[PDB]
Structure 1
Amino acid sequence: RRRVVITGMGMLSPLGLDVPSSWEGILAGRSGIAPIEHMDLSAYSTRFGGSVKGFNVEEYLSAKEARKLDLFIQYGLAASFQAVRDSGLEVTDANRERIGVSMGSGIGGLTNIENNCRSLFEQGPRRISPFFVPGSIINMVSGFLSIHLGLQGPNYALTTACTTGTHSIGMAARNIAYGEADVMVAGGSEMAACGLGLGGFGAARALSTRNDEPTRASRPWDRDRDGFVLSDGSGALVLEELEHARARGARIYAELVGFGMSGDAFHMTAPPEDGAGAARCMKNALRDAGLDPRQVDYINAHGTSTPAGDIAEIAAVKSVFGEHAHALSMSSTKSMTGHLLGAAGAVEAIFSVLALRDQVAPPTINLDNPDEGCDLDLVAHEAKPRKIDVALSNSFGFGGTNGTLVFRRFA
């Protein structure tokens, strides 16, 4: 098993059109949530969310290449191209077989699907776009990235709702550790803010309806939370074998030392109150990393601002970490970004690596009145400079699908 490091990163989020802009918002405690302007939601129960603002796909692709592609693919490609540029890696005939891709999505091309269904119902099947299928199916992020950059290694795509970006990064790391690849571009992307998306989640009563104050909507572990905030964007990491990164003089942000999974096997959307599945997942990830719970300094929580979800994670952290639960810092950056679904674990793995780089825990904004038992250091309200040698990122997603990543300062 070879060591795996992070050498490039890329992002579109509700806080910015790249990583440094996003992270500057994060550390300032800025909200990226606002009334949605890209469509008319006056008929809907939730009318706000986390949108990517001012994205120009022409920075990344020709007009010819871009018109075929759903926004979730456009966003995954943007993050991907940023991460490859940031890495400095040169792709050649000598290494292309050894560079793969694993970009995922929770729901994929819902906008294109809705628009092609309109054509179908109103006009007939021959009005469907000839690019509908390739521009909309989930594995075409990985497909198009590999074609655009000539990447010939392992090529696949995860779809695990809120855990997508976490699993994608973890499994890509396993590719590298196993010797299937030397480099992987991994992460996720999502653009589910169409009528079907907001309508669908609203019908399931999953979303906050705090339409009067959108920036106060996402409030993880706060007694007045009322559901998650739907957000859009992408994240991508360049994962690299350690000897390969060193031989080319790559800048190394951090090491990816552990990856853990479990299933709650409990309920379609609420975890058990004791967070038993989440606990097993975190332990699995710590043990994969060869770390004791006392070695953990920062956790970037799943923390979506849901009743059952948020408290289960508090219970799970207490179970795993014992008295040390009170020494570590845990925060939910979803307090500012909302829930990017398939891209959540990607952008949050980035925020974890950057907490390492900058020695600072990002805040949980809006944490005005912590609920019963929510008495840990949840970094309420403002960023906390502190020693961080080891950072976790948790994703405890729809269906009870759990993943945890463990990153460490590189030495």
Structure 2
Amino acid sequence: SRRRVVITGMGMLSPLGLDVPSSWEGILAGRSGIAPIEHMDLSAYSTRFGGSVKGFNVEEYLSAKEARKLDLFIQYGLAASFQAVRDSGLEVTDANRERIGVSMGSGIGGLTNIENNCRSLFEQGPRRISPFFVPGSIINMVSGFLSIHLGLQGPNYALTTAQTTGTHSIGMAARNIAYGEADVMVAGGSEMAACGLGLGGFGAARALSTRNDEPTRASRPWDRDRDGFVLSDGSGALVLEELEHARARGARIYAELVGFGMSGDAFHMTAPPEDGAGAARCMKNALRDAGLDPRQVDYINAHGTSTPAGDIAEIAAVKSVFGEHAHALSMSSTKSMTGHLLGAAGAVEAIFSVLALRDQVAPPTINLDNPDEGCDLDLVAHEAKPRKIDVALSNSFGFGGTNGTLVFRRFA
């Protein structure tokens, strides 16, 4: 058998806001967080915009001195993590600290830091490399610094599965609790890849929208005029908790995590298969894991990256899995508003899926002006749609054909 897992705390930095309720308000109003990137000469780049975190004050979380040691992606992950633990109301003690762990991941980790230290290395040689270069850049330092700050002695690890990271981190944290390896996990992801290397890296693959004239219209999942994804920064963290542990201390429960699916496409390094066979296996695995029939799904937070092939693959996957129910569920891409937070995408979209269940509302797919061939599902074009949502799915598909699906359900 298996223990039940609920969500008792959430935290976020996104292009829409410095916390969950501000981000969520932007989502339900169809606001874009996409803008030209500031304090950075992107003249020579084919993309000059994305989703930046605006007005982040790390000194709400850390001393100036401790913040200087950490890449922005670690600062963001720590901010989301501290918020989520505060939101949960959990009291860490000598009696429970071995039962509380962390799995905060990243797709691309410390690019800003790598970039600044390459400058020093090429210009001045190795003796100007910061002593904190390695520990201040490694992807497991959100889990590390969080565990040290809060005295957490449970399972301590970090996933890196590109654009699937946040979904896998949360799913595998849920397994830790379900199988009795922990009672509480802080799980999610963080990303800050708006450096030359991030915009340049994805730019060289021609994976990014180049709609520089209209940044807010660039992210247009399933729209016939989409031209690639929008690079965004931020973090999501959830407090996952064994149900009886949550009930005993009187925790506020947002929702239950009932299902986790993984699959590999085994198809291509960066492109999904046209028929989304991989995404379909992963969703079927997630529903089987939850003991749910495809008919019980009401809302899907799609990967919905605004790439030609990715968006169409997800429509095919959903038609395949859900058959005669495919039109009855609502599916939206909040990436239409947030852009693509890469490893943090699954973390902020799990929170948006939980909030869809709390507020009984499907967030919009903004910019869906002209649905493409075969994109005839309920994609919640333009505006939020209040509706019955008992069961919400959150999908992530990433480089290497790696797939993740989370299944959340209303808790009462």
Distance 2:6 2:261 in 1: 17
Which 5+ residue runs of structure 2 have no aligned equivalent?
Answer: none
Distance 2:153 2:50 in 1: 37
- Could you list the per-position Cα deviations for residues 139-165 of structure 1 after superposition, in whole angstroms to 9, with x for gaps in the alignment? 111101100110000000000011000
Between 356-365 and 113-122, the greater mean CA deviation after superposition: 113-122
2:332 alignment counterpart = 331
Distance 2:369 2:264 in 1: 32
Q: How do 1:45-60 residues align onto structure 2 when only pairs under 5 Å count?
A: 45-60=46-61
Cα root mean square deviation, aligned = 0.5
1:93 alignment counterpart = 94
- Could you list the per-position Cα deviations for residues 128-186 of structure 1 after superposition, in whole angstroms to 9, with x for gaps in the alignment? 00000000011111101100110000000000011000000000000000100000000
Measured after TM superposition, the shift of residue 320 of structure 1 is 0.3
Distance 2:208 2:306 in 1: 9
1:322 alignment counterpart = 323
- Local SS of the residue matching 1:185: strand
- Local SS of the residue matching 1:216: helix
Distance 2:282 2:385 in 1: 26
- Could you list the per-position Cα deviations for residues 284-306 of structure 1 after superposition, in whole angstroms to 9, with x for gaps in the alignment? 00000000001000000001000
Distance 1:328 1:39 in 2: 42
Distance 1:271 1:230 in 2: 19
Distance 1:35 1:288 in 2: 42
Distance 2:393 2:39 in 1: 34
Distance 1:38 1:2 in 2: 48
2:133 alignment counterpart = 132
Measured after TM superposition, the shift of residue 390 of structure 1 is 0.3
Distance 2:399 2:49 in 1: 22
Which 5+ residue runs of structure 1 have no aligned equivalent?
Answer: none
Percent identical among aligned pairs is: 100
Between 342-351 and 269-278, the greater mean CA deviation after superposition: 269-278
- Local SS of the residue matching 2:47: coil
Distance 2:5 2:273 in 1: 33
Distance 2:315 2:234 in 1: 27
- Could you list the per-position Cα deviations for residues 237-273 of structure 1 after superposition, in whole angstroms to 9, with x for gaps in the alignment? 0000000000000000000000001011111111111
Measured after TM superposition, the shift of residue 38 of structure 1 is 3.1
Measured after TM superposition, the shift of residue 189 of structure 1 is 0.1
- Could you list the per-position Cα deviations for residues 6-58 of structure 1 after superposition, in whole angstroms to 9, with x for gaps in the alignment? 00000000000000000000000000000001312122110000000000000
Measured after TM superposition, the shift of residue 64 of structure 1 is 1.4
Distance 1:68 1:128 in 2: 12
- Local SS of the residue matching 1:377: coil
1:366 alignment counterpart = 367
2:192 alignment counterpart = 191
- Local SS of the residue matching 1:335: helix
Measured after TM superposition, the shift of residue 386 of structure 1 is 0.1
Distance 1:91 1:261 in 2: 31
1:266 alignment counterpart = 267
- Could you list the per-position Cα deviations for residues 371-410 of structure 1 after superposition, in whole angstroms to 9, with x for gaps in the alignment? 0000000000000000000000000111110000000000
Distance 1:258 1:36 in 2: 37
Query: Normalization by structure 2: what TM-score?
Result: 0.99
- Could you list the per-position Cα deviations for residues 327-380 of structure 1 after superposition, in whole angstroms to 9, with x for gaps in the alignment? 000000000000000000000000000000000000000000000000000000
- Local SS of the residue matching 1:326: coil
Distance 1:126 1:178 in 2: 48
Distance 1:399 1:382 in 2: 33
Between 114-123 and 98-107, the greater mean CA deviation after superposition: 114-123
Distance 1:244 1:170 in 2: 19
Measured after TM superposition, the shift of residue 310 of structure 1 is 0.4
Query: Normalization by structure 1: what TM-score?
Result: 1.00
Distance 2:39 2:320 in 1: 43
- Local SS of the residue matching 1:234: strand
- Could you list the per-position Cα deviations for residues 43-90 of structure 1 after superposition, in whole angstroms to 9, with x for gaps in the alignment? 211000000000000011111111100000000000000000000000
Distance 1:124 1:328 in 2: 57
Distance 1:184 1:345 in 2: 16
Distance 1:204 1:44 in 2: 12
- Local SS of the residue matching 2:349: helix
**Structure 1 segments of 4+ aligned residues over 6 angstroms from their partners:** none
- Local SS of the residue matching 2:229: coil
Distance 2:336 2:160 in 1: 24
Task: Give aligned pairs, total.
Answer: 411
Q: How do 1:138-177 residues align onto structure 2 when only pairs under 5 Å count?
A: 138-177=139-178
- Local SS of the residue matching 2:394: strand
- Could you list the per-position Cα deviations for residues 93-119 of structure 1 after superposition, in whole angstroms to 9, with x for gaps in the alignment? 111000000000000000100111111
Distance 2:248 2:22 in 1: 30
Between 36-45 and 14-23, the greater mean CA deviation after superposition: 36-45
